[PDB]
Short mmCIF file of C-alpha atoms and ligand atoms in Angstrom, two decimals:
data_model
loop_
_atom_site.label_atom_id
_atom_site.label_comp_id
_atom_site.label_asym_id
_atom_site.label_seq_id
_atom_site.Cartn_x
_atom_site.Cartn_y
_atom_site.Cartn_z
CA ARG A 109 -1.55 -15.63 -0.09
CA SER A 110 -0.37 -15.04 -3.67
CA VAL A 111 1.82 -17.58 -5.46
CA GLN A 112 5.54 -16.80 -5.16
CA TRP A 113 7.52 -17.78 -8.22
CA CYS A 114 11.25 -18.39 -7.98
CA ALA A 115 13.69 -17.18 -10.63
CA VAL A 116 17.12 -18.81 -11.03
CA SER A 117 18.74 -15.72 -12.57
CA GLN A 118 18.34 -11.95 -12.86
CA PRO A 119 16.93 -12.16 -16.38
CA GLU A 120 14.28 -14.61 -15.12
CA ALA A 121 13.53 -12.30 -12.19
CA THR A 122 13.07 -9.49 -14.70
CA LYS A 123 10.64 -11.55 -16.79
CA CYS A 124 8.79 -12.57 -13.63
CA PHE A 125 8.12 -8.95 -12.71
CA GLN A 126 6.99 -8.25 -16.25
CA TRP A 127 4.66 -11.26 -15.94
CA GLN A 128 3.50 -9.85 -12.62
CA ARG A 129 2.72 -6.37 -13.98
CA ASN A 130 0.78 -7.81 -16.89
CA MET A 131 -1.31 -10.12 -14.68
CA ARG A 132 -2.26 -7.03 -12.66
CA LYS A 133 -3.04 -5.04 -15.82
CA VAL A 134 -5.46 -7.73 -17.04
CA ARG A 135 -6.74 -8.19 -13.48
CA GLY A 136 -5.87 -11.88 -13.29
CA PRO A 137 -4.38 -13.93 -10.41
CA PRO A 138 -1.31 -12.20 -8.94
CA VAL A 139 2.20 -13.64 -8.96
CA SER A 140 5.03 -12.54 -6.65
CA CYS A 141 8.70 -12.82 -7.59
CA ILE A 142 11.65 -14.27 -5.67
CA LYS A 143 15.19 -14.11 -7.08
CA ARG A 144 17.91 -16.73 -6.67
CA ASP A 145 20.96 -17.84 -8.63
CA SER A 146 20.45 -21.54 -9.32
CA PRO A 147 17.86 -24.32 -9.51
CA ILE A 148 19.04 -25.81 -6.21
CA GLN A 149 18.67 -22.43 -4.49
CA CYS A 150 15.05 -22.13 -5.67
CA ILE A 151 14.37 -25.72 -4.59
CA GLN A 152 15.44 -24.95 -1.02
CA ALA A 153 13.81 -21.51 -1.06
CA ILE A 154 10.56 -23.34 -1.81
CA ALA A 155 11.28 -26.03 0.81
CA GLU A 156 11.75 -23.37 3.49
CA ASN A 157 8.63 -21.48 2.43
CA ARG A 158 10.41 -18.48 0.89
CA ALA A 159 8.89 -19.33 -2.51
CA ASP A 160 6.16 -21.62 -3.89
CA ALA A 161 7.02 -22.70 -7.43
CA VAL A 162 9.78 -23.16 -9.97
CA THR A 163 9.94 -24.90 -13.37
CA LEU A 164 12.55 -27.66 -13.67
CA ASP A 165 14.11 -30.07 -16.16
CA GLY A 166 13.84 -33.75 -15.16
CA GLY A 167 17.34 -33.88 -13.68
CA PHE A 168 16.37 -31.25 -11.13
CA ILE A 169 12.84 -32.54 -10.56
CA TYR A 170 14.72 -35.58 -9.26
CA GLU A 171 16.99 -33.59 -6.93
CA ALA A 172 14.00 -31.54 -5.79
CA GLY A 173 12.14 -34.69 -4.74
CA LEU A 174 14.93 -35.92 -2.46
CA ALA A 175 15.03 -35.13 1.25
CA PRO A 176 15.13 -32.69 2.91
CA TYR A 177 13.21 -30.85 0.17
CA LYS A 178 10.59 -33.42 -0.84
CA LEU A 179 9.17 -31.29 -3.66
CA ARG A 180 6.59 -32.68 -6.11
CA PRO A 181 5.73 -31.84 -9.74
CA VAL A 182 2.31 -30.16 -9.94
CA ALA A 183 2.16 -28.91 -13.52
CA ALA A 184 3.92 -30.12 -16.67
CA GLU A 185 4.84 -28.08 -19.73
CA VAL A 186 3.13 -29.07 -22.97
CA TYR A 187 4.87 -29.12 -26.35
CA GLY A 188 3.87 -29.58 -29.99
CA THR A 189 0.64 -27.88 -31.05
CA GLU A 190 -2.94 -27.51 -29.83
CA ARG A 191 -3.99 -30.33 -32.15
CA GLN A 192 -1.03 -32.61 -31.37
CA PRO A 193 -0.03 -31.83 -27.75
CA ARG A 194 2.62 -33.81 -25.88
CA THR A 195 3.85 -33.88 -22.29
CA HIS A 196 7.13 -35.52 -23.30
CA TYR A 197 10.10 -34.97 -25.64
CA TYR A 198 13.03 -36.87 -27.12
CA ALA A 199 16.69 -36.47 -26.26
CA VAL A 200 18.74 -36.66 -29.46
CA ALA A 201 22.34 -36.41 -30.68
CA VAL A 202 22.55 -33.97 -33.57
CA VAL A 203 25.62 -33.79 -35.82
CA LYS A 204 26.65 -32.25 -39.14
CA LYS A 205 25.96 -34.28 -42.29
CA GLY A 206 29.17 -35.35 -43.99
CA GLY A 207 30.80 -37.15 -41.10
CA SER A 208 30.85 -40.92 -40.67
CA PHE A 209 31.42 -41.37 -36.94
CA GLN A 210 28.57 -43.02 -35.04
CA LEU A 211 27.23 -42.79 -31.48
CA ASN A 212 29.74 -45.44 -30.37
CA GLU A 213 32.67 -43.49 -31.85
CA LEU A 214 32.64 -40.20 -29.92
CA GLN A 215 35.92 -40.85 -28.10
CA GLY A 216 38.17 -37.84 -28.70
CA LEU A 217 35.52 -35.67 -30.37
CA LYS A 218 34.01 -32.32 -29.26
CA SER A 219 30.63 -32.11 -27.53
CA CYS A 220 27.97 -29.52 -26.76
CA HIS A 221 25.60 -30.03 -23.81
CA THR A 222 22.57 -28.12 -22.54
CA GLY A 223 23.89 -28.00 -18.99
CA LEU A 224 25.34 -30.16 -16.22
CA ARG A 225 22.84 -32.68 -14.84
CA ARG A 226 20.07 -31.72 -17.28
CA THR A 227 18.16 -34.62 -18.88
CA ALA A 228 18.75 -34.46 -22.65
CA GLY A 229 22.06 -32.65 -22.37
CA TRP A 230 23.75 -34.74 -19.67
CA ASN A 231 21.92 -37.48 -17.78
CA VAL A 232 20.73 -39.40 -20.85
CA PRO A 233 23.85 -38.98 -23.03
CA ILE A 234 26.46 -39.56 -20.34
CA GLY A 235 24.29 -42.45 -19.23
CA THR A 236 24.11 -43.93 -22.72
CA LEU A 237 27.88 -43.47 -23.06
CA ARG A 238 28.99 -45.07 -19.78
CA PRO A 239 30.10 -48.32 -21.44
CA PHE A 240 32.56 -46.26 -23.51
CA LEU A 241 33.93 -44.27 -20.57
CA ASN A 242 36.67 -45.49 -18.23
CA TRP A 243 34.85 -44.34 -15.13
CA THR A 244 36.01 -46.06 -11.94
CA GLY A 245 32.79 -45.01 -10.24
CA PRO A 246 32.59 -43.05 -6.96
CA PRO A 247 34.37 -41.38 -5.32
CA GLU A 248 35.43 -40.30 -8.83
CA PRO A 249 33.37 -37.42 -10.27
CA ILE A 250 31.67 -38.62 -13.45
CA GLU A 251 32.85 -35.26 -14.87
CA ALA A 252 36.49 -36.37 -14.77
CA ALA A 253 35.57 -39.45 -16.80
CA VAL A 254 33.79 -37.52 -19.55
CA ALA A 255 36.45 -34.78 -19.55
CA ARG A 256 38.93 -37.47 -20.56
CA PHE A 257 36.50 -38.96 -23.08
CA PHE A 258 35.66 -35.87 -25.17
CA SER A 259 38.75 -33.86 -26.15
CA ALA A 260 36.77 -30.75 -25.26
CA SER A 261 33.16 -29.75 -24.56
CA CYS A 262 30.85 -27.00 -23.38
CA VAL A 263 28.93 -28.24 -20.36
CA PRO A 264 27.32 -25.15 -18.77
CA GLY A 265 27.51 -25.38 -14.99
CA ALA A 266 30.59 -27.60 -14.83
CA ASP A 267 33.48 -26.47 -12.63
CA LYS A 268 35.81 -24.60 -14.96
CA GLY A 269 38.64 -25.14 -12.49
CA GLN A 270 38.41 -28.90 -11.92
CA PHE A 271 37.30 -30.02 -15.38
CA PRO A 272 38.46 -27.26 -17.75
CA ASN A 273 37.94 -29.52 -20.77
CA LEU A 274 34.18 -29.57 -20.04
CA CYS A 275 34.11 -25.78 -20.38
CA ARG A 276 36.79 -25.07 -23.00
CA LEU A 277 34.31 -24.92 -25.90
CA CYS A 278 31.90 -22.56 -24.15
CA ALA A 279 31.53 -19.08 -25.68
CA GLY A 280 30.88 -16.96 -22.59
CA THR A 281 33.37 -14.11 -22.08
CA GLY A 282 35.17 -13.68 -18.77
CA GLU A 283 33.49 -15.25 -15.76
CA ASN A 284 30.41 -15.84 -17.92
CA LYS A 285 32.28 -18.62 -19.74
CA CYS A 286 30.52 -21.91 -18.87
CA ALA A 287 27.76 -20.22 -16.87
CA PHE A 288 24.56 -22.20 -16.22
CA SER A 289 22.57 -19.24 -17.53
CA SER A 290 21.88 -17.05 -20.56
CA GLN A 291 25.24 -15.41 -19.79
CA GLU A 292 26.62 -18.38 -21.71
CA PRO A 293 25.66 -18.31 -25.42
CA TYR A 294 25.82 -22.12 -25.58
CA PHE A 295 23.50 -22.65 -22.60
CA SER A 296 20.39 -24.85 -22.84
CA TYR A 297 18.94 -26.49 -25.94
CA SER A 298 19.30 -23.56 -28.33
CA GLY A 299 22.75 -22.73 -27.00
CA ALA A 300 24.06 -26.28 -27.43
CA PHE A 301 22.71 -26.35 -30.98
CA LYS A 302 24.51 -23.02 -31.65
CA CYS A 303 27.70 -24.60 -30.31
CA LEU A 304 27.30 -27.17 -33.10
CA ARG A 305 26.15 -24.68 -35.74
CA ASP A 306 29.17 -22.46 -35.01
CA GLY A 307 31.46 -25.45 -35.43
CA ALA A 308 32.75 -25.36 -31.86
CA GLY A 309 31.62 -28.95 -31.32
CA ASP A 310 31.05 -32.13 -33.37
CA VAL A 311 27.87 -33.22 -31.58
CA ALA A 312 25.09 -31.61 -29.52
CA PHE A 313 22.88 -33.40 -27.01
CA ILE A 314 19.53 -31.62 -27.22
CA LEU A 315 15.88 -32.41 -28.03
CA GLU A 316 14.10 -33.18 -31.32
CA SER A 317 12.56 -29.80 -32.17
CA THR A 318 15.59 -27.52 -31.82
CA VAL A 319 16.94 -27.78 -35.37
CA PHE A 320 13.50 -27.07 -36.84
CA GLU A 321 12.85 -24.07 -34.59
CA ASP A 322 16.29 -22.43 -34.62
CA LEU A 323 16.91 -22.37 -38.37
CA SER A 324 15.19 -19.37 -39.97
CA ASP A 325 15.95 -20.89 -43.38
CA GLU A 326 14.57 -24.45 -43.68
CA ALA A 327 17.15 -25.11 -46.40
CA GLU A 328 19.83 -25.14 -43.70
CA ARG A 329 18.14 -28.19 -42.12
CA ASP A 330 19.77 -30.27 -44.88
CA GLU A 331 23.11 -29.72 -43.16
CA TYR A 332 22.12 -31.83 -40.13
CA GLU A 333 21.26 -35.41 -39.16
CA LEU A 334 21.09 -37.53 -36.01
CA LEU A 335 23.14 -40.28 -34.37
CA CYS A 336 20.94 -43.29 -33.58
CA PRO A 337 21.60 -45.71 -30.68
CA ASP A 338 21.88 -48.53 -33.25
CA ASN A 339 25.00 -46.84 -34.63
CA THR A 340 23.50 -45.39 -37.80
CA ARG A 341 22.72 -41.85 -38.87
CA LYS A 342 19.26 -40.66 -39.92
CA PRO A 343 17.44 -37.44 -40.94
CA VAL A 344 16.43 -34.98 -38.22
CA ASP A 345 12.74 -35.66 -38.86
CA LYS A 346 13.23 -39.36 -38.05
CA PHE A 347 13.82 -38.70 -34.35
CA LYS A 348 11.05 -41.14 -33.38
CA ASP A 349 13.15 -43.96 -34.84
CA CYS A 350 16.40 -42.32 -33.77
CA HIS A 351 16.66 -40.98 -30.22
CA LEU A 352 18.57 -41.77 -27.03
CA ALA A 353 15.49 -41.46 -24.86
CA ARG A 354 11.92 -40.21 -24.54
CA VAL A 355 11.40 -38.24 -21.35
CA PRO A 356 8.58 -36.43 -19.49
CA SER A 357 8.45 -32.65 -20.00
CA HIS A 358 9.92 -30.07 -17.62
CA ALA A 359 7.60 -29.35 -14.72
CA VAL A 360 6.63 -26.85 -12.07
CA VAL A 361 7.31 -28.27 -8.60
CA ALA A 362 5.94 -27.27 -5.20
CA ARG A 363 5.95 -28.44 -1.59
CA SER A 364 4.23 -31.80 -1.15
CA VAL A 365 2.61 -30.41 2.02
CA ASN A 366 0.91 -26.99 2.04
CA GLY A 367 2.35 -26.34 -1.41
CA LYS A 368 -0.59 -24.25 -2.62
CA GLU A 369 -1.15 -26.53 -5.62
CA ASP A 370 -4.65 -25.20 -6.31
CA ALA A 371 -3.43 -21.58 -6.40
CA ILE A 372 -0.38 -22.40 -8.52
CA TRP A 373 -2.53 -24.23 -11.07
CA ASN A 374 -5.04 -21.38 -11.22
CA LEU A 375 -2.23 -18.91 -11.89
CA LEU A 376 -0.78 -21.05 -14.68
CA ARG A 377 -4.21 -21.76 -16.18
CA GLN A 378 -5.03 -18.04 -16.30
CA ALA A 379 -1.51 -17.01 -17.39
CA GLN A 380 -1.75 -19.50 -20.24
CA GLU A 381 -5.10 -18.19 -21.50
CA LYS A 382 -4.01 -14.54 -21.49
CA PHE A 383 -0.27 -14.62 -22.27
CA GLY A 384 0.14 -18.08 -23.77
CA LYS A 385 0.82 -19.00 -27.38
CA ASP A 386 -0.45 -16.25 -29.67
CA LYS A 387 -2.44 -14.46 -26.98
CA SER A 388 -1.37 -11.02 -25.78
CA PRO A 389 1.21 -9.17 -27.89
CA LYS A 390 2.27 -7.19 -24.83
CA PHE A 391 3.71 -10.21 -23.02
CA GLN A 392 4.54 -13.81 -23.92
CA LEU A 393 4.68 -16.31 -21.05
CA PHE A 394 6.60 -18.59 -23.41
CA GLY A 395 9.36 -16.41 -24.85
CA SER A 396 12.62 -14.75 -23.81
CA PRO A 397 14.36 -11.49 -24.81
CA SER A 398 17.05 -11.70 -27.51
CA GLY A 399 19.88 -13.97 -26.38
CA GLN A 400 18.00 -15.11 -23.26
CA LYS A 401 17.29 -18.85 -22.90
CA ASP A 402 14.00 -20.39 -21.72
CA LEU A 403 13.24 -17.82 -18.98
CA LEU A 404 10.90 -19.32 -16.31
CA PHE A 405 9.45 -21.78 -18.85
CA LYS A 406 10.80 -23.47 -21.98
CA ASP A 407 10.62 -21.06 -24.94
CA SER A 408 9.03 -23.91 -26.90
CA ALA A 409 6.32 -24.74 -24.35
CA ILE A 410 2.76 -24.10 -25.48
CA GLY A 411 0.81 -24.67 -22.27
CA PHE A 412 0.35 -26.71 -19.09
CA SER A 413 -1.17 -30.05 -18.03
CA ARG A 414 -1.95 -30.59 -14.35
CA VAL A 415 -0.26 -33.51 -12.59
CA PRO A 416 -2.79 -35.63 -10.66
CA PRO A 417 -2.40 -35.80 -6.83
CA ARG A 418 -0.07 -38.13 -4.91
CA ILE A 419 2.47 -38.36 -7.74
CA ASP A 420 5.97 -37.69 -6.45
CA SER A 421 9.11 -37.08 -8.49
CA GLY A 422 9.87 -40.80 -8.83
CA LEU A 423 6.47 -41.67 -10.31
CA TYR A 424 6.54 -38.65 -12.63
CA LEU A 425 10.04 -39.42 -13.93
CA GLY A 426 9.23 -43.12 -14.27
CA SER A 427 7.65 -42.20 -17.61
CA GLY A 428 11.10 -41.71 -19.11
CA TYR A 429 13.43 -44.38 -20.49
CA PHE A 430 16.74 -44.88 -22.29
FE1 FE B 626 15.20 -30.90 -20.45
#
């Protein structure tokens, strides 16, 4: 019994226990906490029944759905507002106003990515850029090809030893440099945007709402614009007409057989009502301590939408496009 959530880092484990204590306080459905060190570790933990659920970006929903795991998305994060909810988001290329280079002229420049194999920060951009890379295909690691494309980048999760260029721009100190966690200041959407804001990189591959949410002074928004796939640059609020892709939101996955979908959904439904957007001041299901990035759920998520039965990873991801 009891849904067992899987954390991919200590800070997430910490938030999970806080979530747990609060659910108990308000006498709602209980949630147990399992701690691991990476998305792939949680995926297998769930596959071998040592955990029941974990929230994942599209790139990992894909890996989770492959054998021998065969995990399936059961609940999707919702973004936007209560009036205008959305179960999707747009991958965009944000740059500083003032430059003239376009999406097809990134050769030799500096890049900031959310993390290795994440949708908006890697899969879409490196996919959209293939024609400009000199990748000889397997057995060559796509990483080598991009590491020789961008003069330097910050790609959290990349092997600092094999492709140092992919990690050179990362701000983490010591072994934290290039970590696929909050240990790395440039990790995830907000981190990649910071990598651009700080001037470490010339472009950041993130989603459409980051600039608007991360700038405490709206006047600073005037310093940014986007790179459109038609080789032109447009305002940040014109993302609908200027994005590299529109993809389905991150999602909670579970076993496709005896995955406890009903229980997981009941937990999320109740957790959303009590600790969701603007609910309890004691705990926010969608929020992370200072410097922490998207613990357990995206910091920008506002709720959940249940995924109808018999929809595997492939079908769920099929909603996305370049
Ligand atoms: Fe994502």
